[PDB]
Amino acid sequence: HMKYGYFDEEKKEYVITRPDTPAPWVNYLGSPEYGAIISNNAGGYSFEKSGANGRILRYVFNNFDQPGRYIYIRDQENKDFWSASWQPVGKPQDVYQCECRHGTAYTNMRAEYSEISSEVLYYVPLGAAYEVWRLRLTNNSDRPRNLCVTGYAEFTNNSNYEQDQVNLQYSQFITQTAFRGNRICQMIHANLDQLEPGKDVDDKQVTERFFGLAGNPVTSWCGDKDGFLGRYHGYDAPKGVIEGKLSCLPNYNGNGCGALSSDFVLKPGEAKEVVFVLGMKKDAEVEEILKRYEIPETVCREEFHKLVKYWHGYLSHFQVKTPSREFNTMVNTWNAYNCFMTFIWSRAASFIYCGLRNGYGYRDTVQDIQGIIHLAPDMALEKIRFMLSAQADNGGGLPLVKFTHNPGHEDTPDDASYVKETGHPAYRADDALWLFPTVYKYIAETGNMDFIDEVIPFANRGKATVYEHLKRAVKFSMDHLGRHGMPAGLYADWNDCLRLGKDGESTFVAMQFYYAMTILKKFAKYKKDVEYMEFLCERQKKLEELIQKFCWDEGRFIRGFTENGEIIGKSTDPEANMWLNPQSWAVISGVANEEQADRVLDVVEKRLNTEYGLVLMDPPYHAHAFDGALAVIYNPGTKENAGIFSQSQGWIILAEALRGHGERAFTYFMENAPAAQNDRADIRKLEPYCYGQFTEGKDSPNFGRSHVHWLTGTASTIMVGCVEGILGIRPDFYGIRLAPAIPKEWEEYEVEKDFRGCHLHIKVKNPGHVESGCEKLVVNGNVVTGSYIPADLLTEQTDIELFIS
């Protein structure tokens, strides 16, 4: 086909062999503290703390993927020049070979042209607040070559995107650049250099960005973008590159830049390594950083090894070997890396997310925790502590958790100050409920029973044990019930576009509530809280009766009730008569029995499944959308309007695997697997190595096209569907149950899992070629009845053999 790359499972890299990808395929470097997003054509931007308020490099979104981290190589013999990435020069691909390897927190750009080879390793060193472009030049010709390498970085005039892009009458007149031997220093508010140390004028001081070169002397420089590009020149042919010598002039007002040129004389077969460094540091620290890279080869290889060791070591705590190559690729590397990305970066910055953020969405962060629970349990513990501290003392979760979250002193949606500050006017019905699968899955993963009694403060006032925090969430749900005795809709639930009214009732939320009571029943059993346990039993019985009475329809559960009495999701409605999430969570929560779960899954597959996944609902909204059906503003088959919402794909997968339906769970995973779409990139457009937010549904002419890369809730739910669901990795408080749901073709597979200080080597065998089962279980050579391995049986190296047929 027109394949653009393949997966290197040895190096854990996606290698792009053809550079004219259907979209900019990007990778992330560093962390939110210092982050760099880079495309396969070197485009992107860098920032500190905030993508839109701490932006170091200018980037024009929704355009040509420009500017970027450009490295030009010019042959002094024939004045020809090209770029280390295909763009911006865009040489013909019959004479210009190149490849772009995206790895964990690094990107390697190889290119061969005119018998000259270049390799640029872009990375942010582990724990560093700057970025490195390590260029290795190699002469492959039989003659000496004279080359001129030019690095280009386009600074912002202000860290704030609005000041740099909109307030031109101010930001065009505050910057200066200066050359300092081996670097260009850009000064924002340059004229404030004479202020007494610590003082400020109009809440502004001099800030400094830098662009330096180490490993070779600088032969010419330029700090003025226009002077570097030339009048009416694009990045494909900069004047300063064309002429073979930069202006050696700075910028004074206008648009600054970092442009450094360096001459190379390479013998036949000779290679040389240099580094470009970019960041937001003061002069002395920059001089130290540049001195560190004087001879770059060894230090750069050591930093690269440290990066790989860190990220691959986190990945190594769970590795699978199954007959499905796409499944292996996603579970072992790319889904896990994506889960770490969503856990660490939240929704801070991408090529779609480019504005300001006030804080962390509650349900988003809580759910993102689940993706990395089996990989970085201490990280998950700290994030769970944080999110529990973001719960108000009424049990509800703060819809927006401020970056300056200060437990014991925060305001809530019940305060006008919080609404004015965050922009979230009310509590949402579903937020706190997500705490139940998350917290449980953490405690089941680690056996950290003590955490149940750990005292954590509430957001506004008071403190409670984790157990009491969950009880307060349940109380919040019970303190806000609708007219059918089911949880009131409040502002909204998981679906931002489904406004049922504050007195409506969402079936999604009702099933979340039922599942929360199941989890809390487990907790109360451990705590010997008998009175609360019988309370939970009675409330769960009542809620199950209510759900079956008012939400069960024609082989399906309805979507919910509006506050005006309307029934959303009824089978006879002309539009949106079949919804995915109610059935997914009927199976997940256990509200549906065995036959009911099978029936709703059958109807889901028949009505909602497509080649690229399951649509959120069907038919799309258009001519019969009620007052709160906000999704109707979107094009059909797009976003919440009957799009294939990728996050929901996780839930249904898990649901299918909870019923032992290995064939359907794996089919859904494959339909949504980006690796499985590597041969259909042109339809998918989006990166084949990370998850997007949604795929355009069947009701769109662009069926199969994915949007919003990397930073979505999809990574976590699909990771859970793969690990907890398909692979049957189902721990509880006192051990781990193995109940896989796999495709029948799999004869056997292996799992290496770190679990409670022990390494589990698991061989699952399926000689009968079934979907699920439990014929034999052998733990350390001893047969164990059932499919459950108590923690008492675990040794430092535990061999497990599970025959499912």
Decide if 39 contacts 361 (C-beta within 8 A): no
506 is a site residue for Cl ion (CB under 5 A): no
Binding flags for a second copy, 703-742, as an x/- string (CB under 8 A): ----xx----------------------------------
Decide if 650 contacts 718 (C-beta within 8 A): yes
493 is a site residue for a second copy (CB under 8 A): no
Looking at the Cβ atoms of 396 and 692, the one nearer to a second copy is: 692
Q: Rounded to whole angstroms, how far apart are CA atoms 98 and 73?
A: 14
Helix H or strand E encompassing 417: helix 416-422
Q: What's the CA dihedral at 522, 523, 526, 531 to 10 degrees? A: -90
Q: Are strands 797-803 and 758-765 parallel, antiparallel or unpaired?
A: parallel
Q: Which of 3, 143, 204, 267 binds a second copy (CB under 8 A)?
A: 204
Judged by CB under 8 A, the stretch of 111-119, 350-358, 505-513, 652-660 that binds a second copy is: 350-358
Q: Which of 248, 352, 481, 683 binds a second copy (CB under 8 A)?
A: 352
> To the nearest whole angstrom, how small is the minimum distance from the Cβ of residue 249 to a second copy?
9
455 is a site residue for a second copy (CB under 8 A): no
Looking at the Cβ atoms of 138 and 165, the one nearer to a second copy is: 165
Going by C-beta distance under 8 Å and a sequence separation of 6 or more, which residues neighbour residue 509?
Answer: 429, 430, 433, 477, 486, 487, 489, 493, 560
> To the nearest whole angstrom, how small is the minimum distance from the Cβ of residue 648 to Cl ion?
7
Residue 406: other Cβ atoms inside 10 A? 10
- In 3D space, the residue among 697, 717, 702 whose CA is nearest the CA of residue 610 turns out to be 697
Q: Are strands 26-30 and 35-39 parallel, antiparallel or unpaired?
A: antiparallel
The 3-class secondary structure across 296-314, one letter per residue, is HHHHHHHHHHHHHHHHHHH
Span 25-64, contacts to a second copy by CB under 8 A: 60-64
Specify the residue for token string 């009766």: 545
163 is a site residue for a second copy (CB under 8 A): no
Q: Which of 182, 581, 609, 693 binds Cl ion (CB under 5 A)?
A: 581
Decide if 678 contacts 688 (C-beta within 8 A): yes
Give per-residue burial for 481-508: e unless 16+ CB within 10 Å, then b: bbebebbbbbbbbbbebbbbbbbbbbbb
- In 3D space, the residue among 26, 8, 7, 15 whose CA is nearest the CA of residue 685 turns out to be 26
Q: How many residues bind Cl ion (CB under 5 A)?
A: 2
- In 3D space, the residue among 587, 600, 430 whose CA is nearest the CA of residue 513 turns out to be 430
564 is a site residue for a second copy (CB under 8 A): no
319 is a site residue for a second copy (CB under 8 A): no
261 is a site residue for Cl ion (CB under 5 A): no
Q: Which of 231, 284, 298, 595 binds a second copy (CB under 8 A)?
A: 231
Looking at the Cβ atoms of 126 and 497, the one nearer to Cl ion is: 497
Q: Which of 324, 438, 477, 495 binds Cl ion (CB under 5 A)?
A: 495
Q: Where does residue 8 rank: exposed (0-12), middle (13-18), buried (19+ CB within 10 A)?
A: middle
Looking at the Cβ atoms of 16 and 547, the one nearer to a second copy is: 16
Decide if 583 contacts 596 (C-beta within 8 A): no
Residues with catalytic function: 496
Specify the residue for token string 């492959």: 140
353 is a site residue for a second copy (CB under 8 A): yes
332 is a site residue for Cl ion (CB under 5 A): no
CA contacts within 13 A on the Cβ side of 87? 21
Q: Which of 90, 447, 462, 773 binds a second copy (CB under 8 A)?
A: 90
636 touches which of a second copy, Cl ion, none (CB within 5 to 8 A by kind)? Answer: a second copy
Span 680-709, contacts to a second copy by CB under 8 A: 693, 696, 700-702, 707-708
Judged by CB under 5 A, the stretch of 220-228, 434-442, 577-585, 761-769 that binds Cl ion is: 577-585
Q: Rounded to whole angstroms, how far apart are CA atoms 399 and 413?
A: 8
Q: Where does residue 594 rank: exposed (0-12), middle (13-18), buried (19+ CB within 10 A)?
A: exposed
Span 632-651, contacts to a second copy by CB under 8 A: 632-636, 638-639, 641
167 touches which of Cl ion, a second copy, none (CB within 5 to 8 A by kind)? Answer: a second copy
Q: Which of 17, 93, 141, 191 binds a second copy (CB under 8 A)?
A: 191
Q: Which of 10, 574, 623, 781 binds a second copy (CB under 8 A)?
A: 623
629 touches which of a second copy, Cl ion, none (CB within 5 to 8 A by kind)? Answer: a second copy
Judged by CB under 5 A, the stretch of 11-19, 98-106, 297-305, 578-586 that binds Cl ion is: 578-586
662 is a site residue for a second copy (CB under 8 A): no
Residues that bind Cl ion (CB under 5 A): 495, 581
